[PDB]
Design a protein around this nucleic acid. Sequence first.
RNA 1: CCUAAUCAGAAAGCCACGGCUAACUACGUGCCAGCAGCCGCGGUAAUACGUAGGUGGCAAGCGUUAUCCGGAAUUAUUGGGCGUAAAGCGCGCGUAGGCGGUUUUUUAAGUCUGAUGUGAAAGCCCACGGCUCAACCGUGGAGGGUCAUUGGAAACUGGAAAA
RNA 2: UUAGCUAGUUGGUAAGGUAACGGCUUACCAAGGCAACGAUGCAUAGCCGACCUGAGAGGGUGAUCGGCCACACUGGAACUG
Lengths: 86, 131, 90, 135, 192, 164
Amino acid sequence: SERNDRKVYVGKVVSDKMDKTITVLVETYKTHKLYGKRVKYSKKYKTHDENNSAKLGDIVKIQETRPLSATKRFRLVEIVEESVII
Amino acid sequence: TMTDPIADMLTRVRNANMVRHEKLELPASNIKKEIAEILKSEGFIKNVEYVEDDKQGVLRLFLKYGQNDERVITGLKRISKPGLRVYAKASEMPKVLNGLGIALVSTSEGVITDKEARKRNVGGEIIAYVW
Amino acid sequence: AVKIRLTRLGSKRNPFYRIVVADARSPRDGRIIEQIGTYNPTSANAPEIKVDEALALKWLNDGAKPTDTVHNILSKEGIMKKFDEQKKAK
Amino acid sequence: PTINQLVRKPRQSKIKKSDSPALNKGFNSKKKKFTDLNSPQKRGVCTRVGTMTPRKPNSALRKYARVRLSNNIEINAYIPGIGHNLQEHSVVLVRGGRVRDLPGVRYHIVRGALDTSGVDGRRQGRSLYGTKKPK
Amino acid sequence: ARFRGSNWKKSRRLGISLEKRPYAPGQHGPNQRKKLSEYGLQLREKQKLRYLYGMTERQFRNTFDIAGKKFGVHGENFMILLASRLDAVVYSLGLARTRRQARQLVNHGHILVDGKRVDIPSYSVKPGQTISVREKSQKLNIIVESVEINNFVPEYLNFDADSLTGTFVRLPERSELPAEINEQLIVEYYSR
Amino acid sequence: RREEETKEFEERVVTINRVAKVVKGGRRFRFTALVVVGDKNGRVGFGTGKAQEVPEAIKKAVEAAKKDLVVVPRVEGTTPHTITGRYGSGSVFMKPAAPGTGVIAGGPVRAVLELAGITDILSKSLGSNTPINMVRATIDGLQNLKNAEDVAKLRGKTVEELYN
RNA sequence: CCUAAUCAGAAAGCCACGGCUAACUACGUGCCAGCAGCCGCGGUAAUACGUAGGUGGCAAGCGUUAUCCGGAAUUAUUGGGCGUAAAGCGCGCGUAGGCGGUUUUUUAAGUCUGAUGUGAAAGCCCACGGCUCAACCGUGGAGGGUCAUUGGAAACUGGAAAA
RNA sequence: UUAGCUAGUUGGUAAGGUAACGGCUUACCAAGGCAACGAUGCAUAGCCGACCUGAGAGGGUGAUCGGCCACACUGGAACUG
């Protein structure tokens, strides 16, 4: 079926030390029920590469795919920004 | 390092109330000019006069006082301050002192008094009450 | 395995059943899917009954087996007449 | 405190404590643990009835009793009213409530529910102390 | 415990009318007694409204807070509700000599609200309603004894005296209801 | 300042204490009593005094009460708007109310507001529970209270564009 | 459930009365017996023990006990404080984090705004209707997301670029 | 006054297996993964629509009623369907 534009989550890479898999760190910031301020808490989405195409420190977005391995689900769609030491 | 310019202007205004001096000096800003204009339009400010020198400001304003030298407001403070920013919808927008006072609020189309902001059904981030 | 059925809701002496689509596995007074109408055996002869008769045809056309009780009321209403006019036509 | 300093800690309270520390009853039998069973009153066998005196400025020979409860704990409770129909080995129902005579006793039994019979020497507070309406 | 008291001693305390009245009840009654604090004033007002119709407190609070539902001022609504009871409608129209006679007339069922039997004095009368006398029982000594005297008639309630039929017309108020009272104290009593 | 016995008045006492002064030998005491005074039509004032007996002390408090006076800006049988009073940790907070509610507050402040002619008003005492400080804070709140005409004259614009 | 007949005859008590908190007199007692939620009563004239009368509250219910919330602003975002009352560590360097000078352009994530789907029903609230009324039940409405998608705005927060 | 936890763990390959994807299981290769934004442990506890309270924000509870989950003297397993 074609009904989902899959949940696209931008983020950055944290490590590349496993075959065809990376650990994208999605970033967002969420509120607090008691007060009304905002604070950011991170996550670490593992991701399925084809040939370890993504690099360390890269900026990339991902999408829902399917359960692919033991606690890794999302696939990459497009590398956003790739660079060297800044 | 100054965390907030609105806090500075409101402290200057209140500290001008406590000793009563017609003239005050404060580095200007676009939001500062707009809120000063709305202050004059409510009736609390006798006159407004911007000046230019290196680089910003410095906004000089002329206060207002009653014939018996009575301060118009009985209090003045902000709501949206750093760390805890605040926002306000169109219907939820508060009526401080009802008609008596007004509620400066910054909107997607510009900063206006509390009234027009509830009339147009467009809210925004409040800045400071005044009453 | 889904059928029109009634869910009683009254308190002790004046029960107030509801017309609603449901699966037979579910409890009579458990969960439902989408409400249509209601039922009331009291305060009037003939009783007071309401019915969707617009989306009720949807569930009869895509599959359901209303009880003979529901047959009575719908035949008194004549929407089941249009249902069979649609079915046995061809 | 500052709002972020209040975000990263749950704004802890001053949670209270109980006034009947045997409002709780441990597991009766067939077990060794102590249940958290709550009750407004507990029965118990009284292993001795005694009498003690309060501290200053009050002075009186105040009548108390130590009782073994269902939860196999040891508490003290003073008997109210005129006359007490109890002694060692007497079972009794127990209420909760502290008295300022002396610590080590913070309950008081209920008169007329258990072996402790109500005293008919009263006619005004009859619904307490077990007295029944006279005619 | 709707009503089984003398109901005079209470009026002796409150100073209100539905030789002996200058005093106060009881042995320590006639001489000097305590002063009145605000809580006492509020309780006195509550009793002065409650014993008037002879109903109870667990009903009083419910009647009070079902008057807190509609719009407008609170007290006036409370009184227009509590004078909208069946006994108020029966007696304040002139079918009795006191409030309790109306209670015995309604619990007996001598009245016919909308020409129907009713056995409660707590029913809420409504506009566009009539009330009858169970015409079989329109000629007992007490009934025709009470109706003949034109005791009083407010303008929100009518009559056909020969036909013994009353009817509600318009919402009353303190201006049209005698035995006028204070509203602020009684509502403030149910605050604390 | 400018006491007047020309208007109607309603004396109202808040509290009485038995207050003592210790000297060598005996122990000297002198009763005290505070009072509030107003005509319940828009004018109010409190009062204090001390004497060796109740009636003389309360008479002193009342005769000193008229000398301090309050304009009581009132509207529609209610305060024009909501405020917070503060005087020496005797904080207090008031807020207008729809008609038919009535003054709800503490005993002393109820007497203060009932005797200043306000019918329906919402408030709650805070901070200290001593009658004197919260009563004085209440009066201070009434001193720095304003109405639509008291402000519309000040600001260049007028009423009917800014109104409760 | 209704018709007709008969009788006030079968159907009422509990708590409290020093203040808080509405409601006092006599007697017994005399730091004993006792009361006690607190402040506290009682050693010979107890409005606080007990009893009698009277009174107040409440009612076919009433009081005690346990538990929870409020009061309690006594976890204080709305809504707390830190000289002396509990509370600034001994101070320094500094990570993570929180916060952010002035102006312009830009993005539209936050924000504001509209629609769409959804937040079962029962329940709370509102309005009405039906059980003699109420309780109750039904009906319908509103309300309810830190919800998702999407159409717009760009002062402010945020992202980028330029002073 | 619970600071390191995890070795089928994490990743891959291949196969098997499951209605299905999946270390779900096997054999081989690799050493990663989780954790101060609170892992793991310990202790308690079914969850929710709601109920009680509170003006409001909140606090407490999960009795009836409905939804979901877990279990049927205790532990293991599988046939039917």
